[PDB]
Design a protein around this ligand. Structure first.
Ligand code: HEM
Ligand SMILES: *[C@@H]1O[C@H](CO)[C@@H](O[C@@H]2O[C@H](CO)[C@@H](O)[C@H](O)[C@H]2NC(C)=O)[C@H](O)[C@H]1NC(C)=O
Ligand SMILES: *[C@@H]1O[C@H](CO)[C@@H](O)[C@H](O)[C@H]1NC(C)=O
Ligand SMILES: *[C@@H]1O[C@H](CO)[C@@H](O)[C@H](O)[C@H]1NC(C)=O
Ligand SMILES: *[C@@H]1O[C@H](CO)[C@@H](O)[C@H](O)[C@H]1NC(C)=O
Ligand SMILES: [Ca+2]
Length: 595
């Protein structure tokens, strides 16, 4: 294709690579190519994009237009027929805690965000897309099949706006459309600090030379910090309980208040920041603000990388972990650390892990109050349940002692997300994330299931019998064939997630390959990887090796009983130990001296 590089922002670079700290945007991580892995650039394409028209139109757009000689089925039709289930009994993952699902969503948010069009500044259209369901331009409505009960009750469609794309915003041709990753591709705590200099400074507390992140000024959690409120209008966290008028939180990533356990996880991370900036000052009273903030933020980034790579990834990828992510051998500047477009769909395996309810537990890990257990859908954009209904301790206890949902070929996504999703500005608890993932897959120009099977070196089933054997499920392969007509045409989100899970893992072979390749790249390709010689000292690394999610909980909450392995399914009190017994992070090794 030989051609030069376009880009939405300026590849305006000011590197001068002597500082020991990461930039906010990700620029300057790679010396030879300073934009690589930086926020607000195109997602990487591991395979060329496939659109209806070769350029920008998703499959499904022109109803005459086939993919490989067949019409693509409606995203909501696939949803109802394949992804849906009624019976929440028996659905829980007997060996993953709810926190395993939660960490997944955290790591995701650190790595990719491809926001719907007009990532811009403020107050834009007054949308007819929701109004009349007329497809056009960036409005790509998810239409209901007849028989869809939502037709009786919600009208003809669900709103869906196409994702923004680089060399921008309204019209373009002859290079295929590329979607934007709005956050840093590096696993770098960008969800805590921001990926733009503008949000990064606003989250900081600069009124005191202490290098602290700003905390809520209206509310405290038994003397401990909350995230600042976001004073932006309109607020969906206000929209959900007008009486309570509790806004969303302000965090390094804009989605932090999407559900209460994510806002919870963000609250712990920030707490850890300030706990970190406080300790460094004790050991180095000479150190200035900017210093304390960088060194804390750098320790926090290391904790997220290690928790993700040491604890999470091996229990996602199972026997495939070593295959795609071998033990580390230093920084390789030849590796592309950019998040691919496909990964952004691959990592949506988490949707199948979200159970239908969230609980609050007390000190004895028994139900907290009379409405301890809540249906997940009442907890989208919900921060009042945190501020006015007990702080984060009871929710953190539930993360520890309640379980993730297990993926299940006959019970894929809970109705709490499949039929009751709330999206900002759309006023009801009646959306379907599954249909959204599938409309999005098409929006982003995804190659189909077999192109990805091919990329990963796996067989590419062409018939029903071949697909039944790959899925090890006769009836599911038959439902897919009936909708799709060929396995060439199955959207990657639903084809990857349909494969049975690998041994000791929670995704199948195809996803383990896509996820595995991405993660290995974000580690090997990151100049600031905690274990890269030079980034930390030998003593600091020995100290950082003792971090666990159990110890983070202990330090930043009033919980005194934690399990040693927080991602496994744990029951109180057998698997729970005193906080005192858990390894501490030791900042002694960060002591430095002048005069
Ligand atoms: C109750 C919990 C969750 C809710 C309410 C939720 C909701 C959403 C929504 C509304 C989107 C945007 C869909 C679009 O417009 O295409 C999204 C995308 C996404 N989700 Fe979740 N989700 C949850 C849990 C998870 C989990 C557990 C994971 C991973 C383990 C996950 C990973 C992802 C990723 C990677 C994306 C794409 C981000 C991007 O690149 O744009 N989510 N989710
Ligand atoms: C909106 O939030 C308020 C809390 O601010 C909820 O009202 C509370 O409900 C229980 C009922 O016994 C009481 O303990 C509180 O005193 C109520 N608080 C106030 C300030 O009125 C209310 O349930 C929420 N409403 C909805 C629809 O979600
Ligand atoms: C900033 O830090 C000061 C000094 O410790 C603290 O008292 C104040 O509440 C903080 N302000 C914000 C907005 O976090
Ligand atoms: C629970 O999962 C962990 C990691 O996946 C594994 O090491 C352990 O054996 C599991 N427990 C059981 C009973 O399978
Ligand atoms: C660096 O990555 C490239 C491309 O992925 C690979 O070919 C090469 O073997 C890696 N470097 C080393 C030293 O292994
Ligand atoms: Ca990041």
């Amino acid at each position: 294709s030989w051609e030069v590089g376009c880009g939405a922002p300026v590849p305006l670079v000011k590197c001068d690579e002597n500082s020991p700290y990461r930039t906010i945007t990700g620029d300057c991580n790679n010396r030879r190519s300073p934009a690589l892995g930086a926020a607000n650039r195109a997602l990487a394409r591991w395979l060329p994009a496939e659109y209806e028209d070769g350029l920008a139109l998703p499959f499904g757009w022109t109803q005459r237009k086939t993919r490989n000689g067949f019409r693509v089925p409606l995203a909501r039709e696939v949803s109802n027929k394949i992804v849906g289930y009624l019976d929440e009994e028996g659905v829980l993952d007997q060996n993953r805690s709810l926190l395993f699902m939660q960490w997944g969503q955290i790591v995701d948010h650190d790595l990719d965000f491809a926001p719907e069009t007009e990532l811009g500044s403020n107050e834009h259209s007054k949308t007819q897309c929701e109004e009349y369901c007329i497809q056009g331009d960036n409005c790509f409505p998810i239409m209901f099949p007849k028989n869809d009960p939502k037709l009786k009750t919600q009208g003809k469609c669900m709103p869906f706006f196409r994702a923004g794309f680089v060399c921008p915003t309204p019209p373009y041709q002859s290079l295929a459309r590329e979607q934007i990753n709005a956050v840093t591709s590096f696993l770098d705590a960008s969800l805590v600090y921001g990926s733009e200099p503008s949000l990064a400074s606003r989250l900081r507390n600069l009124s005191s030379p202490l290098g602290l992140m700003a905390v809520n000024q209206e509310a405290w959690d038994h003397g401990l910090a909350y995230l600042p409120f976001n004073n932006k209008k309109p607020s969906p966290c206000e929209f959900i309980n007008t009486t309570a008028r509790v806004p969303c939180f302000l965090a390094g990533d804009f989605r932090a208040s999407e559900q209460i356990l994510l806002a919870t996880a963000h609250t712990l991370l920030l707490r850890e920041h300030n706990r970190l900036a406080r300790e460094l000052k004790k050991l180095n009273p000479h150190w200035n603000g900017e210093k304390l903030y960088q060194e804390a933020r750098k320790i926090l980034g290391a904790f997220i990388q290690i928790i993700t790579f040491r604890d999470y990834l091996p229990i996602v990828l199972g026997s495939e972990m070593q295959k795609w992510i071998p033990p580390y051998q230093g920084y390789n500047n030849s590796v592309d650390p950019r998040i691919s477009n496909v990964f952004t769909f691959a990592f949506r395996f988490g949707h199948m892990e979200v159970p239908s309810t969230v609980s609050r537990l007390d000190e004895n890990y028994q139900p907290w109050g009379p409405e301890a257990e809540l249906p997940l859908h009442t907890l989208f954009f919900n921060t009042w349940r945190i501020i006015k209904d007990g702080g984060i301790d009871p929710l953190v206890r539930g993360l520890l002692a309640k379980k993730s949902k297990l993926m299940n070929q006959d019970k894929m996504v809970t109705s709490e997300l499949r039929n009751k999703l709330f999206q900002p500005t759309h006023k009801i608890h009646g959306f379907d994330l599954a249909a959204i993932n599938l409309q999005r897959c098409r929006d982003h120009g995804m190659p189909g299931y077999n192109s990805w099977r091919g990329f990963c070196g796996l067989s590419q089933p062409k018939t029903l019998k071949g697909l039944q054997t790959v899925l090890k499920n006769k009836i599911l392969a038959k439902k897919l064939m009936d909708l799709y007509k060929t396995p060439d045409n199955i959207d990657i989100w639903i084809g990857g997630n349909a494969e049975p899970m690998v041994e000791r893992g929670r995704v199948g072979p195809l996803l383990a390959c896509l996820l595995g390749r991405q993660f290995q790249q974000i580690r090997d390709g990151d100049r600031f990887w905690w274990e890269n010689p030079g980034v930390f000292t030998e003593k600091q690394r020995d100290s950082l090796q003792k971090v666990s999610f159990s110890r983070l909980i202990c330090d930043n909450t009033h919980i005194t009983k934690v399990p040693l392995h927080a991602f496994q399914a744990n029951n109180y009190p057998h698997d729970f130990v005193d906080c005192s017994t858990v390894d501490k992070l030791d900042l002694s090794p960060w002591a430095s001296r002048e005069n």
